Amino acid sequence: ATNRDQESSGFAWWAGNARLINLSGKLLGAHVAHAGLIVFWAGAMTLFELAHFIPEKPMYEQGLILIPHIATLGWGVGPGGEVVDTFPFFVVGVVHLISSAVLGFGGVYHAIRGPETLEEYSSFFGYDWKDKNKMTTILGFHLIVLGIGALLLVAKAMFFGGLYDTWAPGGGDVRVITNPTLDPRVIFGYLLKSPFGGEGWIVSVNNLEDVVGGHIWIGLICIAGGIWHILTTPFGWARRAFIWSGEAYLSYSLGALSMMGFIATCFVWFNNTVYPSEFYGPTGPEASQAQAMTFLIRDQKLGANVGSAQGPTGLGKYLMRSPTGEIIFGGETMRFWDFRGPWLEPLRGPNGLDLNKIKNDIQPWQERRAAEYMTHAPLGSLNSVGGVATEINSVNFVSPRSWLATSHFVLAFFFLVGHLWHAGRARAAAAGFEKGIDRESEPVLSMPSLD
Amino acid sequence: ERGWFDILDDWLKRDRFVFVGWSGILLFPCAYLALGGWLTGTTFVTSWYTHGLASSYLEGCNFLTVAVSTPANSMGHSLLLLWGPEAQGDFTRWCQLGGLWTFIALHGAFGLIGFMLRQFEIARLVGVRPYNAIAFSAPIAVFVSVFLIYPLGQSSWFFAPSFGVAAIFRFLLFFQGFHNWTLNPFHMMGVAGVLGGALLCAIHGATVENTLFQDGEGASTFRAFNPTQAEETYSMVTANRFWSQIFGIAFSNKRWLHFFMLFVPVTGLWMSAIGVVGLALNLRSYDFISQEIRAAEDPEFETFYTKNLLLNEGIRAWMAPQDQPHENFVFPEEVLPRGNAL
Amino acid sequence: ANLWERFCNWVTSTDNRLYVGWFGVIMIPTLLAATICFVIAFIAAPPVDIDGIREPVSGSLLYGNNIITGAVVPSSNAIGLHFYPIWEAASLDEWLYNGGPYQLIIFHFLLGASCYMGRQWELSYRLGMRPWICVAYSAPLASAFAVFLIYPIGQGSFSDGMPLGISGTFNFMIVFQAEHNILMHPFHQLGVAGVFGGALFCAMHGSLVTSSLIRETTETESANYGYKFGQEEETYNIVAAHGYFGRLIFQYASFNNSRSLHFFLAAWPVVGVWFAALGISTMAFNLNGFNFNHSVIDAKGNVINTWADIINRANLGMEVMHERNAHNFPLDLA
């Protein structure tokens, strides 16, 4: 039992995985076994979702999070997001589940049977955390892998049947992307957009050409970065800025994953392009807009002149102006005027919502969609009672958008905490005081008093 | 000299797994019966006849919604003794009338006395000062003020808190809507003592753990402490410099620090109790008269204070008919206060 | 040494009465801006159209508030999540009507308080301490993020951010209860366990150490003089304190390890408050408290109320009265 108690390792059982820091073979096993757990869940969860799936109800009425990801890639769906074939969902689930066995086998082998350190076995596979060149090499390999993955998305969208396009002319449908956006002014433009209202940084991406083009760039950037990191060693200024240890590296990645988690939370909460509402349900903004649309339609059918109808406050009951003058829906949904969606855009003119289009061009499909979205707003209880907090039991619904945003907030948050924990510890360990202050060399005792 | 009193005293004070003591004679039966009564009621007993509510696992409630609910308003402040004039010895009827509520509140009160006596008794035996008992006066003042004094000023025990998770939540919301209790400076002092105490708990624990001396080779640092060691396990001097530099002030005296940790939450609780004693009499901090004079005369004048009272008016109108069934309130749809649409 | 070197040495100096540091370089200006704006606004700001319905709410002392009613009022619902710096307004009068001070204050504050957390790490490093005080501070910090940034993001407006004021805070609480049934949410329940328990353990620790202070003084002086700053010897007898507490409950329910005790004292409130913060941050995306409305039904189908249904009636009161001129349509969807 090498390094598998507190007396030999210096780490208690509850920090037992820290016993692995310098045991590259066993740590490889932990990592590969873990990847197995991730892949297992993707596989198992998909098959559970498929088993539980009723094709003629919306996905979002059924507690699905994975089938919607598969559908968004253009698999299993047709016009409007209707399910035309569940077999692609079965395939994805099965292949992930099978693959997990392989990862679990490798993981278990390296963890309990293989060489506990890799360095005397292989100069290629072994590593010292403190060897800057080998760390950038392995980083480089993994960048190449990630770039190939981004190009897989590109290949799916351009060469293997397309992606689900909620914006497709004449109604959402799977569409092949033939003209991905390559112009770096557009692609990198998203990156410099404000994250505030009406701008929304990268989360505002609203067409598949930009999405695909973005992955072309990312894939090429990542492959190039990987080659770069294989072929170079960190420069002097980077050597002086960072802590070079396994725990430090963990810390940096925790920081990064935290940031990505908060971004993902915002993506699924606001974005209805890469998270089509057909699969994920309406966004919060979308459903609030849909309510105003619903009652505008109803009251106008009854004879209301909706442009001229003054509400209790003096603002338009149905229609008002945004702070820059655009015609928008009124009531509290004034906050959501930056919302855009395919059911609403046909009513939009150069100056915003167009009164003549409103009076004459609203189609029954738009009424249906607005009613659907108003009544599947992402509000609901922890026990999955759909609606406002005061609603009675009846409807079993919590939007996938709420599940995905809340879970990823929680996870991003604790990952920030882990970043702080491990970055602070990495620092202290590198400097030599992570176990406490030396009684005979207490630094404050050598400093002048403050007063 | 060597009599039965002294012999019993010997036995009561043996050093055993669970200490008994003279205080035990009061504490153990009272605590057991309060806890047992709660578990019995939440598991099996209704609130149909007292409140028009289901309140037990038996009827289909969960851990959050079960309660032992207060007696009907018509019982007034009856002790509701099993052998009393209401239940007349009938255990079933006693349960249906809310006898378990006074059972739990009164055995609980005597149990708390017993617990505080235990704190004194043990302190005396071990030879420490009785500050833990002194500190426990705060929980006593809260229990006595909220569970006994409050309903005693009101019409009946009906309006005490019912012993239950959701039932306690209802008690909070009642206090907002009817007493505007958030506005009360005694509650605010309560808040500051509780949140302040929580702050001090967090910050003192973190400071000690982050100024530890290296007293072992282990990266897990708990084993580098020995209860019998003479020396401080952390550096007060480094802790002091850190806080002086971060926040501007810092503790320098460990006895002061640990006294302050008693004082803050204990004082907060005691202030909150004083407020609740005023609420027993509806002697609220409900209003700012100057605000009301202005708002009555000036329909454009609006503050967060006025906004909250509108919420309070909603709470009262919407909750009263079901929350106070003995009043037989019928509020026609047309009288209910509502804003636009909702 | 050159100027930059000298400057760096001063910024990171362990000898400044108040530590500056690199975090402090951002913290100091942002906190001062937030503070100065808050003070001026709290005193002298005119009414603010919080709900975007041309219904201005007075928050300042000079416009009829006292300390309890006063606030800096959230930015207008018309603005939503749009960034409204001074320079996006046509004038300061407009900026003020629309609640511009709120955004300036909360953004400078959240940046500054984040740097306060970083600064706690930084000084711990300069002094050779262990690094995790900042992690305990992440709990209140996360909570401030939840109420000033995350909740607005979820609901689509800074108008739904917590107001900067005492009564404003209560308004935020009551409306949150109406809209999310927070009391019935297990993360707020964990938060309560966190702060009630933090208070309990604070009193308990204080009382037990105070109980066991070693006699070093006479009856006509404060026992506090029995401890001298920086003495090597512990000032209370932990063996006696454990002897006491272990008998109060039973032996193995009491800590005889000071490190383990002080870790528990940190962890209990911090973890509970992290769940409080996560409660607010997840109700931000309308995953709400448990809803047992009409969960208990008799043999016929009659609803048999429980205490959840009574809560529901209170919540309804709040819901129907809040922002009484702002809703035109039947559902409050954000």
């Binding site: 007063d451 | 501007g248 002030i249 | 002392l61 000079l62 300390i67 920086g230 003495q231």
Partner: peptide, 30 residues
């Protein structure tokens, strides 16, 4: 008068912070 009184108390508190920090009794080791 009310406003003056609130602002006065606040300003006294702020001054107190200054004295409590910069003119504290300095902590001294033994």
């Amino acid at each position: 008068m009310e406003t003056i009184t609130y602002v006065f108390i606040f300003a006294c508190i702020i001054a107190l912070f200054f004295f409590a920090i910069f003119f504290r009794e300095p902590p001294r080791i033994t």
